[PDB]
Amino acid sequence: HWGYGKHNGPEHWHKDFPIAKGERQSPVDIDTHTAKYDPSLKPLSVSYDQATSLRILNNGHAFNVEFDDSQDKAVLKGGPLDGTYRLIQFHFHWGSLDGQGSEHTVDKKKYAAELHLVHWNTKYGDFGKAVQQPDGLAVLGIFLKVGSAKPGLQKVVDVLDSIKTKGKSADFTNFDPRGLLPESLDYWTYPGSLTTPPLLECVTWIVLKEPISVSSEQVLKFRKLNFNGEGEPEELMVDNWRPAQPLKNRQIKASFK
Ligand SMILES: CC(C)NC[C@H](O)COc1ccc(S(N)(=O)=O)cc1
Ligand SMILES: CC(C)NC[C@H](O)COc1ccc(S(N)(=O)=O)cc1
Ligand SMILES: CC(C)NC[C@H](O)COc1ccc(S(N)(=O)=O)cc1
Ligand SMILES: CC(C)NC[C@H](O)COc1ccc(S(N)(=O)=O)cc1
Ligand SMILES: [Zn+2]
C-alpha cells in the first residue's frame, strides 16, 4: 500500500491514484510576491468554543484527533467559504529534522511541521459525500516552527506514548483546538486536493500566514511514533509530507496587504 518510503512514496502514488497528476493537486509553494491581495475576502470565522473531541488514532500515516461532527459544534465559516464547514479531525505532517516537514512552502521555505484542521461542507450531509465535491472540504493549515513550547499542544504530545503503532487509539475528550492557533488569522487561499491518497480534488485550502512555535521536545515526541503496527520492525513515523505540486492554472489569493 501507499506510504512515504522509497518504494511506496509520493513518486509512486500516481500508479494507483492517477489524479496525483491532476489539475488542482496539493500542497503547493506559496510565492508571496505572486499571491494577489483580494479585498473582497472576508475575515475567517473560527467557532471552536463548543468543540467535542473524542479520540486520537494512529492510522499508520499520521495521528488524527477526531471530533463529534454530528452537530454544528466546531465550525469554520467566512473567508473564501460559502456556508458552514464542520471540524471532523486534525492531524500533522512533520520531518526527521527541523529544516523539513511542512507540505506547503512559503517562497520555497520548509517549516518543521504543518497542522491540518479538516472541515466538511454541511450541505453535503456527511464527510464521504463531501470529498466527492469540488467545494466539499476546507482545510485550515498552520505552520509549525521550533522555538518556545506551545502549551495547548502538550496534551496531544503526552498521549502519543499510548498510540505508538498503527491502529492504536486512545480516548481524547475535552481537548480545545483553540490552543493550537496563532494570534493572527491572516491567510492565503487556493483550490486544491487532499495531500494523501485518494488525492481527491475537493479542498478549499486556507493557509495561515503566522506560524505557531513548538519546542524541540514537543516535535521530538512526534518523531518517536511508528508507521508500523505492534510487533513489526520499527519504522519511525517521520517525513510524512508530500512535496509541493505544480500550481498549473491557479491563483493564490491573500487576505492581507
Ligand atoms: C506490504 C507488501 C505486500 N508489499 C506491498 C506491495 O509490494 C505493494 O507495493 C506498492 C507500492 C506502491 C503502491 S502506490 N501506487 O499506492 O503508492 C502500492 C503498492
Ligand atoms: C456522530 C458523531 C459522534 N461523529 C461521527 C462522525 O461520523 C465522525 O466520524 C469520524 C470522525 C473522524 C474520522 S478520522 N480518523 O478519519 O479522522 C473518521 C470518522
Ligand atoms: C454526517 C457526519 C457525521 N459525517 C462525517 C463523519 O465523519 C463520517 O465520516 C465518513 C467517512 C467515510 C464515509 S465513506 N466510506 O462513505 O466515504 C462517509 C462518512
Ligand atoms: C475517501 C474518504 C472517505 N476517506 C478519506 C481519508 O479519510 C483521507 O482523508 C484525508 C483528509 C485530509 C487530508 S489533508 N492531508 O489534505 O488534510 C488527507 C486525507
Ligand atoms: Zn494533512
UniProtKB/Swiss-Prot annotation:
Effect of V118 to K/R: Strongly reduced CO(2) hydrase and p-nitrophenyl acetate esterase activities
Outcome (variant: H116 to D/N/Q): Reduced activity
Keyword Protein transport appears in the UniProt entry: no
Example of a GO biological process term: positive regulation of cellular pH reduction
Protein's job: Catalyzes the reversible hydration of carbon dioxide. Can also hydrate cyanamide to urea. Stimulates the chloride-bicarbonate exchange activity of SLC26A6. Essential for bone resorption and osteoclast differentiation. Involved in the regulation of fluid secretion into the anterior chamber of the eye. Contributes to intracellular pH regulation in the duodenal upper villous epithelium during proton-coupled peptide absorption.
Protein name listed in UniProt: Carbonic anhydrase 2
Miscellaneous note of the record: Target of drugs used in treatments against glaucoma disorder and breast cancer.
Annotated site (Involved in the binding of some activators, including histamine and L-histidine): Q89
Name of the encoding gene: CA2
